[PDB]
Amino acid sequence: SYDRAITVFSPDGHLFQVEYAQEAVKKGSTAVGVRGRDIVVLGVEKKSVAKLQDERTVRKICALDDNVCMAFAGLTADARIVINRARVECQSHRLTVEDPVTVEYITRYIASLKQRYTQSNGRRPFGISALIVGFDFDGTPRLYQTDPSGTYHAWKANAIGRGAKSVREFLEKNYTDEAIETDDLTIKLVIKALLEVVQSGGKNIELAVMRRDQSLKILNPEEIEKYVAEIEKEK
Amino acid sequence: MEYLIGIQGPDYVLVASDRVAASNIVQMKDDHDKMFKMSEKILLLCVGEAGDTVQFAEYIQKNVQLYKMRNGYELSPTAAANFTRRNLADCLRSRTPYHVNLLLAGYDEHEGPALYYMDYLAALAKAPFAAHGYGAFLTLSILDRYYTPTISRERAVELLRKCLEELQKRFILNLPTFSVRIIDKNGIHDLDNISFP
Amino acid sequence: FRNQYDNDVTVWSPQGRIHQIEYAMEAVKQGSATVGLKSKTHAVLVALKRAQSELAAHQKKILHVDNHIGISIAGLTADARLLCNFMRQECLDSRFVFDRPLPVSRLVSLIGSKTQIPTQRYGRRPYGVGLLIAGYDDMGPHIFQTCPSANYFDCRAMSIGARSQSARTYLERHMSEFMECNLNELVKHGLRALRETLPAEQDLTTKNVSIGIVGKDLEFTIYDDDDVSPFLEGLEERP
Amino acid sequence: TGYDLSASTFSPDGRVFQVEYAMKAVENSSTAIGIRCKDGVVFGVEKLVLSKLYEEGSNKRLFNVDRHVGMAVAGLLADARSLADIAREEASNFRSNFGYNIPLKHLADRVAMYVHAYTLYSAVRPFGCSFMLGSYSVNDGAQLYMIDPSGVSYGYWGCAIGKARQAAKTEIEKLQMKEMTCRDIVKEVAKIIYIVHDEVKDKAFELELSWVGELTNGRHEIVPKDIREEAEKYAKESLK
Amino acid sequence: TTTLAFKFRHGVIVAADSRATAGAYIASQTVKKVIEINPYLLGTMAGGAADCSFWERLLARQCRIYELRNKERISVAAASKLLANMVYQYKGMGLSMGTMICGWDKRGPGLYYVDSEGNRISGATFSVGSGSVYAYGVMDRGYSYDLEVEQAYDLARRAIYQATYRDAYSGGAVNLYHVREDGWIRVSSDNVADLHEKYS
């Protein structure tokens, strides 16, 4: 009745197509983000190799710029478009104001794009939610989340995608100032959280870190194996 | 009025530029940097009409870095040269020609060091050594005299010092300080400024 | 059934009636009542304002287009604001170009054209607002009404909005005396006329009344809550 | 049956029913008639007085679309006023380009084509107005034209539009307009309108008349009130 | 005109004259040529007064919009780059501007010079206007990064005074500002006649 067009409000004022896009996000692979004191760690599950596929082509985590990166859960093609648009906006902002982009600026831009696609019929919402991580000029860690609706919110730590409810409950339990004390502890926290919802530990998680003034580093599979081994042993 | 010089070598390219930005007669800035790093192993040197230099340099820089972010590997020096040449040539016909004279210096793992030259009309030429500006007329003969394709980098900085002290001896404008840096397989390396007091 | 033929303005009905335009004409009935009446030397607009709550201020029902023209609205405030902007720009254009006040008849003709264009085309809805336009020009005092249908009328007096038939019948039975009235007598007549529309429990107040007067010597002025008290005091009581 | 919803559609039996539905619009209107005689063309309208509050000389259904032509309308008054604006624009453009007053046949053709544009496209409805046009020029002569909502245009020695079209047409038919002169034709137009007016259904009417002819030197104009009163008194007397 | 700006340890000192001329007619001797773009950064105007005023005001509204949107005050570098891009869009159309955007940011003291030609440059010392060349000598001989605040005010006043002495199209009074880390302050407005009384 009222779920076929984005423009039409429902009785009780629910816009339902954007809700359906938010539901589409839930289908996607899990992603998790956590703010350490000097690190921001972004972890994403890997669906499966399929044994005849090249892993390099598929990468959920991406770097918008030197100081900002994102991970997504939702439609992969839409994520690719949004990533490219945010990258060109990053370089354009540097061009315009001779300064590097702030994490809140880029998440605002991505949210504005998603909002622009929601408002008008003849265009469907981007079926993605994103986890944007970066370090600002002051050096404070920043974690933001975006959704198809176009609202953005800072999170100390969060998850998106399938099993987001379970892993975020686990993270609400586990997260504390103590865990954020160590960079290795932050990485281990996100690894344990993804382990809460994933078939196998090392094979099916792709993880990355950003340090205070370093570029994004996708942790090697051997490093992830070492960290899960340390996590597994402690239990 | 602004001096650019570039010397290619076996495994390096040496580049230097004057550090003067000037109004009519007053030399507003003594430490202006005319070198823009498009990527880790490529530099763009730009001189020309004011405003156009910084605008074009920044545009090419941001486009190259966008290429880096999108595709995960840096552009080749030759590809960056052809790209900036295309952008400059398209604008030449248009109502907003960037009056800029550029020198692009790069190192490629596959193709080794490269130095590229382009004028405001957007011609492109690879060269062993090249220079821009009125000082180039004085200093090119120094390079044509003492240059060897097998020149070592110590010999290259010596040759560059000879070229610049010739400007100090004879060129009418005052270009007291020059910046120097080398590109190699490691990447762009800053060198001590050749400063003639 | 005949649910069809009602969907859009561009669909004629089997008996030659565009039902969306009529449904738009229903919109004026929703709004609070307004009354306008004129004398040989003056034209008056009076309104009944409504408030969302006790704490909230009463809505603006009379708007000034120019010194020589002002309007009062019944129906959608959005369409009212849009049409008022259009009218104001037209009057400003006339003053800029010809250095004369725009004729009120010509202004309502422009309103009629602008309002008519939605009804015939698919897309924008009919302007679901009814306006009473009152002004003084060289020809004399004038009062017009415009419907959500682009048709407009010239009136000795008129009332639009909810329960306006009572005001219309009062005006009709008292119309003959209006022409020779003073402005005080005329505003009092209009106030009684809108008092007919009110519920029996409700009564005229300083708050819920707004009065708009224009004449040969008087530019359009909206007398607000405090300023309506001179005009209201004369009125006696409910019959 | 979804055939009648839009004008782009055709019925399976080859009928565009939206246009006919728009033709039914004018029948809601009060009657209007125009009669052509040797001297010129006379127009008349039965303008029903909906309320005493409404000013006289308002809701005019007789428009001047140029100095030498006048227009009388039946159907939706909004569409009619818009069509009058279109006709005035066409006449002004004709004067500006070709340097002389527009021929009535050409003006009728252009406004008729503008009307016919709307019957084709789905986005926009047919006009809800049927109107008569009349002019007198010493070269062309007296001319009366009527345009339906379809965009059909024809020349009529006498014509009627609106609710009482058929009765008005028989009354006009028994008139011999060709020999007659305008100052009599105004009286007979008043007679016909008073006849066709239904006192029971329609409370009251104010006869609105106009003409164009040699007596005006070829300018359409509203009747002088003395002549209006004479014609109205004659119509009331003949009515019995 | 003459406008002067230099960076020193305790901030940026901005100075300017107050004379505006049409031809050789001194239309005003009280023009305020230091434009308070914001409470926290300010600019100067040389060249066309209308051009400088309009474009600096537009920069001011852009800065306030940025502050509201991003919850942070714009950097002097970003402001200078915005103005430089805006004027460069109109290059060759006859705008005449030379202006020094001055403020503090997270970096520290900020001094930039931007002109209608298209240059944007940051430096320890700058001067813009017809009397720039005269002001430069006094400022250069007197300048040091480690300078007392009073001494900085003094060299700014003396520089503008000598520039007005030599240059015909600069005169009036010397308006002086100190950009301090909290914000800008207006330290003095001394007339050139009183300054001639003092220095001589």
Add this chain to the structure above:
Amino acid sequence: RRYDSRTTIFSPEGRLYQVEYAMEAIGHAGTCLGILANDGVLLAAERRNIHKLLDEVFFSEKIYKLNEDMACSVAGITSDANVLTNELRLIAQRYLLQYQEPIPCEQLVTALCDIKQAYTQFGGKRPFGVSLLYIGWDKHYGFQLYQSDPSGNYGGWKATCIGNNSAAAVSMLKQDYKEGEMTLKSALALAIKVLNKTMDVSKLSAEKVEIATLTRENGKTVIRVLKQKEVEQLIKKHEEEEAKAEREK
């Protein structure tokens, strides 16, 4: 009721059913295959058109050359395929004009996939009912095989099949394909094997298949279509080998 129309409405549970219906279309298409080897990469396809009165005038019905350094094979609607191949060639030549270097394979695939995503998102146009394999050599990553779908989503595959019986093709390739051990000859034999398994015809006609190989010789890529004699020899060798394997038991 119906949340499958207009390609711009997320159905409840958040699925775009028009693109899924388009993905259904490619399954009807003639099977296409691509295998990656150490020395080269090949494309093999089943010429579904086997009408007697058809002429093989063209370079290939399914295989298209997009650039000096890459090619593609297409499964899906032929008209949309023609449009997409034209767009691909224009994209590659635009990159060559701009940078004076050959288009990277992944970049070209990504550009066309961006087009295909765009057609999904905006209302009026239908999604491209096409899926096509890309094969190419680039200096950065060497030989590469890529697959694309109507959704605008692509991936890199060592070996994959699209079209009819693609699941059977992938199941056969999974067991047979040796990672890091293939050569172009062995990959050709594997291609003949999986094509014989998938294709309903008992004997691969050698006019019912088109095989093309991409190899780097003398520093220049060569894209060659195996001629009818070569593929005849290949099917003869496969028949002999399979019969000998049969004869032993």
Add this chain to the structure above:
Amino acid sequence: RFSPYVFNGGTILAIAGEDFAIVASDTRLSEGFSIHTRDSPKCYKLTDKTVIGCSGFHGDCLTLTKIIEARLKMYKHSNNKAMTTGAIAAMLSTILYSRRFFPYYVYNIIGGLDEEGKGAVYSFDPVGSYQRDSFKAGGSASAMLQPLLDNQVGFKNMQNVEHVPLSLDRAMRLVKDVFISAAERDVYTGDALRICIVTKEGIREETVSLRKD
């Protein structure tokens, strides 16, 4: 060939006060060496608290007056208040700068009473740079008029002379005298002076004769 400007002459003057402002102008319009008309006042009443005086190309003066009146009406409609003198000044600056590249050849003076109740005068170059001034003269005779205003009103270059706040009577005397001198020695300015004085009561217009050429 076609020149879009001609200097139609005239001069304008404005002098502020503690509680008043005065705006005064010639009433002559002159193209070349000929006098178009001897009664064309350059002062226009924008609001009760504000007067504008314009001198230069008369077509630009006319169009700018119409534009300012229209935008004043628009501001009144939108904001339900009258424009202040400073608001009119800023709006005029923006309007003048709108045509930086095909400018209005007009010298404008805005004189009025500010919100505080004091007199304020705003003076504009042709391209819209504007400054609050205690007094200024505009137009052809700016060079002649403004020095005497600087001496008498500003007490400039006067030693051992007390500073008195200007009064309405002294101001009007000074305005009449300076315009008489400009009538003597400027060809463009003469044949009448319209003095428009703005006070809390409102605009009051007085005309005094100046010598016909």
Add this chain to the structure above:
Amino acid sequence: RGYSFSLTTFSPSGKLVQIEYALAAVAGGAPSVGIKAANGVVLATEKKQKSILYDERSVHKVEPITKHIGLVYSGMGPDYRVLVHRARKLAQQYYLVYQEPIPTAQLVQRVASVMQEYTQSGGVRPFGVSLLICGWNEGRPYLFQSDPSGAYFAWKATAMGKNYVNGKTFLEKRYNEDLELEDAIHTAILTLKESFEGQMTEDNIEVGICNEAGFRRLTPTEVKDYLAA
């Protein structure tokens, strides 16, 4: 269901069914036959007229796009003419750009691109016509078909229109690659002779041939001479 009416809607099972309906419109069109001989290619179609009143010379179902290209259709007559004008224009654009006669393969590609261009937009309908485009280029004959879908195929010989399946079977029985066009025209008229349901005459059929000379429509006297056998 809704898939039936829309043109930009894939049906379940992934069918653009409006295009299939356009192909059904083609199938109702009159028979047309194309046979590619070694030295030429013959295009033939029936031009059956409702009455003697029709003037056969007025309109032709076989039209030349260029000197060396000509085509014939089965389907909607108006759509045929829209695209024949567009084809002639495309060929002339090619001649302006390259100063060479357009190849037949290139022309069929371009007109098929046009036909595809029409299918995508909802506001338009597909062309309810299919074409047999024949040409002689590089001392070789060519025959092509272009469908409403925007797809094109290369046929040694084929038939469109009514009874196209039976005509194609008759052709594959009768077709030999070694045929000269003198025989191929006979085979083509026989292929049509299968499906007339009337006594064919010189007027009732229209036939044209291409060769090294170029495309031509052989006259009524010529087709009478060939029909005499």
Add this chain to the structure above:
Amino acid sequence: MFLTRSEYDRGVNTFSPEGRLFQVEYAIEAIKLGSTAIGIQTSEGVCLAVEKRITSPLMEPSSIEKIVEIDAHIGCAMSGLIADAKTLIDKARVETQNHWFTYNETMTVESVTQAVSNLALQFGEEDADPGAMSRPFGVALLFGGVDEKGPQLFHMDPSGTFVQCDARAIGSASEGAQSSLQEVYHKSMTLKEAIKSSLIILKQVMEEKLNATNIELATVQPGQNFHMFTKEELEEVIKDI
């Protein structure tokens, strides 16, 4: 006896029988989904308060911005769609700065509210511009600022209608919160009393127990600019209650 045909609610630009235009009415129903916000106008100033409705502890409380600053003189509080709220806030800010640029003065609260209202009106699509949302703006705003007329509180709704209000509540519990406003409010109350009363009402309506984290509070007084109560100031007042 139930008649639920509606069949006219879908699609703006359709006048239903009785001419009610139900899409806008549904948008006005939409703000009841939003968090409750509350405004009180007093002689000493105007205060604004809202319940944040934090979903999870991990979400940063500062990021939720349901009270914002249009300018120093005017602030806004919003309830309804955060996204289209951000759009209207941007319009308000740019219009204030445009007014400063053009007239060198500060807009009145009524003028700013009219400026945003004009944008809200554009759902009708009378303009031909593509970049205007077809749906009405599903948000209600409370504009509070000190102007030439003193403290003023204006209410704005999805229709684009706007009115001054001495005290108003928007959001879910606006019904009932408005009754509490009507009983408590008297024109003479100082801003301290207004703050306390508004926080009492917010405590009543809010499901969770009131805490410094879950509310946002602000005030603009004639001398001061727009000010947000910090964690400590919020702690002091919520302790005082």
